[PDB]
Amino acid sequence: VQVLLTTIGAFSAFGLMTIAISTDYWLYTRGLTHSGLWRICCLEGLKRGVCVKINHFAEYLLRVVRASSIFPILSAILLLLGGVCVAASRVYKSKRNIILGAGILFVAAGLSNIIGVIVYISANAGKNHYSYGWSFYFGGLSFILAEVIGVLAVNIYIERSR
């Protein structure tokens, strides 16, 4: 039962996190122009449809991380590396040690996912009422489902050893 709830969760967390970083509908500011991750597409900006890329230019280390969004992407890279580790349960089975290697990547992506928001909120503010769009809440599901998949992958490793 739990052996199948992990492979379906890896493809439901990686395929869901790659969408949150793709569509640029994270933040809604004010004309009302919806924001994004790498570029914002303006609306009601003296033009019908305009979408231009943002220009970000020892505090310079935070600007490059916000521009080169590696933390919200590194979590997706670890989700696919862990998604193929649990896929190694059929081929080259009876190892009882490759499942533990997936429980580390499933939680290491959650640490790099919460960080990708701290560098995004601190750089956002750095009156004007701004809200979070539906595309920003998708990234939140990429962290909750990253912990349920991190408790279900290690629990199997404990049962296999016991």
Partner: protein, 51 residues
């Protein structure tokens, strides 16, 4: 003219401040909404790592 039957003067008129009833969640003011959510997500993150 007769004796003044009423005294007056140039006065100031400002908007009366209302009671300003605080919200139900007024105790969550010293920390922003982003801080409270980040604490919860860090709370579950530390717990899973500790397990």
């Amino acid at each position: 003219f007769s004796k003044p039957f009423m005294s007056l003067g140039i006065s100031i008129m400002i908007k009366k401040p209302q009671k300003s009833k605080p919200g139900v969640f007024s105790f969550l003011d010293p920390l922003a909404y982003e801080i409270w959510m980040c604490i919860v997500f860090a709370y579950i993150g530390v717990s899973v790592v500790l397990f």
